[PDB]
Amino acid sequence: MNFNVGVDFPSFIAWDGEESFPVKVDGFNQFGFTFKTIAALTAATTFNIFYHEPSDADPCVPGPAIRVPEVPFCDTVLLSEDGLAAVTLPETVTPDSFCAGTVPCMNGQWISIAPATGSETNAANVQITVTMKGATR
Amino acid sequence: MNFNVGVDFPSFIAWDGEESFPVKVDGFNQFGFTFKTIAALTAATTFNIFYHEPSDADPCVPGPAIRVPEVPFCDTVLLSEDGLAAVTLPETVTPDSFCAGTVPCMNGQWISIAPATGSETNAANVQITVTMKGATR
Amino acid sequence: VDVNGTSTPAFLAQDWRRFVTSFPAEYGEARSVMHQNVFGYLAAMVDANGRFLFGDGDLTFTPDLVRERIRISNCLPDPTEGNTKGGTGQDAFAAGSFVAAQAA
Amino acid sequence: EANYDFLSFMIGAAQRSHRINRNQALMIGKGVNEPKGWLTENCFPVFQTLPVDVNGTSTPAFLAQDWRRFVTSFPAEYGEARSVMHQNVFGYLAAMVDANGRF
Amino acid sequence: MVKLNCRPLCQAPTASRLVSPPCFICRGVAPSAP
């Protein structure tokens, strides 16, 4: 008795192993992340979050990819040396285990994920996609 | 205040425009499909659906892609060539415009989507994902 | 103990009785502490005949440990690591692994 | 007519079929339209006894020691646990024999 | 809508075997030799 859940929480590709994809998050108001590997990893992997602004040439296309600054919560013990938002998939994840994450503060209209340099080898086996929650219109 | 929605409706890739991937839904109870068009198409894009069963070699690996059967209901009066569940994204669908789909009756362990014979070149510019719901595992 | 020439470590009910009886009696009543894994590995002891060394003929061995002065615990080092390290081949107890204790 | 009341016969051998299929499902119900059987769910801790080598064969088997441990190895902090199996397995256990020949 | 009904004439018996748990064996004895 499944419901059509394409009319609610529609997912979109973000990183298909070797290509980033800015997805529009304006109409939506909440969004998370699912990390799924197709093989085993070799070393720990890191992924950098970016965001785009509407390029003046057209309001419905992403502009450049500007960096996202991670905002600290309470009870924090460490900060990224630059303050920049980035997630990490730890080593020893078997490719039948999805992994969750979510940025607590949005900025821009298109979110994007890129393989942090020096870790793009495992990136191929990694696939990151995004789901959302709201329509608002 | 975007909740961590990785858990509580995650999702995975199903068809990256190049190849299919059976996405386990046996551990789930409700699910659905989300299409996405990246470029203007040429004609109606038909997609065959399939369901899989666990290989006797390993209960955690897909077997073959058995043909999911189309099921009718109250006003279903347009059955296909004896009934084989398969969908079709129509023409006149611009980019940044996602679609929704579902299968009324689940069968097997996981689902898979393939470009119907003749829609491959059009399928080259589509990306299809699957999103689950609620499950207790 | 020896096996096929190899001298892997092990543990026998004889050694258990030796340890529990070796307490200086004049001290006083000294109870013992151990993991349920150890008591299970013990109650499942089989002789060369094929008989259970304890509770012979009722598929289980269950004496009241209070009478047998044994308090049980479950977050002790548990020498049978994950209840999988009895030892005939590569399952040796890895000599240097706590088994049990006893005190007043 | 036809004195034997078919109505009550069916009213009985509908609930009987329903009950037996309910039990079968809740035991091994395979996902779709079948309540998930705890057998096929396969997240229970499952212990497999190691085989025995009879004149160099490494033949699978099962002796009373494994059973007694599998019953006792249950963490008592969870509470009282009951065991379920076939009567064939029970007769198999009651038919065990030592090397000398005694039951 | 003629419904059929058929029964056999002569029935055949049913035999079977009664395999039973084997000898007690040791999956490793302590005092042994290579």
């Binding site: - | 995650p10 386990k24 | 009895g86 030892g87 | 396969n42 497999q48 599998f70 | 999956r27 004895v29 302590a30």
Partner: peptide
Amino acid sequence: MDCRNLCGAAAPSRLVQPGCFI
């Protein structure tokens, strides 16, 4: 930051028992 699993994969738990050790 919160990670999951799909299959049980708890199949092999080979319990060992004290053989005839004498």
